[PDB]
Swiss-Prot record, chain C:
The RNAP catalytic core consists of 2 alpha, 1 beta, 1 beta' and 1 omega subunit. When a sigma factor is associated with the core the holoenzyme is formed, which can initiate transcription. The chain holds residues 342 to 390 of 1119 of the full protein. Belongs to the RNA polymerase beta chain family. This is DNA-directed RNA polymerase subunit beta. The gene is rpoB. DNA-dependent RNA polymerase catalyzes the transcription of DNA into RNA using the four ribonucleoside triphosphates as substrates. It comes from Thermus aquaticus.
Amino acid sequence: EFRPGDKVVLPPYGVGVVAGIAQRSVSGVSRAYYQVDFPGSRSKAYVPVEAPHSVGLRKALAPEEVPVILDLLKNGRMPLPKQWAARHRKTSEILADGNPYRIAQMAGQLRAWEVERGLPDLDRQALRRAIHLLAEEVAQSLEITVQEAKRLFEEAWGEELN
Amino acid sequence: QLIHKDTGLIKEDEVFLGHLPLMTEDGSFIINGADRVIVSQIHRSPGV
Amino acid sequence: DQFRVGLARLARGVRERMVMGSPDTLTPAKLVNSRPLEAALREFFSRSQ
């Protein structure tokens, strides 16, 4: 369940607070619907209360989960196919998937490769867009704007952030 | 609003379209920084 | 008239983006377009008699 003021995630919307629940008229009878808003978008969202766990509606990590993610961010890697197709495809799916542990785990190998040989014009967006959801997630949990939030990664990276 | 056919999941998210020229006081728009005018047209009315 | 007939050219630019890529993660923020409409209006306001 999600109360009015719960801090949640709605892929790929990064983070947003739930405003409440309402009966939206969809087709036939109106099932209950959760409401996820994003002030840094001015968008809007309606999430069915039936199976919230099927839309990948997770919740912002707690301040306790910062170090673990950082540790899997600095070191943790993972092999990927050589031809750009499968590799970038996988990375993309992982991105839209909305999984901070997987996005960070990915960011690790992507980082190891970026300063070695160097990152293709594709995997670059697959890195940037990856660090984006992270930097904002940190801003949701620790309530510190993308300035400070991005200032976090600098430690477990070795370099600053864009 | 972009809605899934099966998932029953709703996604609204307002977007952008473009720029639509506005008419002045006198009744003539400004295209490419020039003062132009839209003259009326005439053709037979629809029907049998 | 030019707005609607120009908007249908956008509707087709809608039906080609959704039918591919990632049908799960999509928003109209990626499904719409400017030019099919923008150019449609810019055309009328200049070239028409």
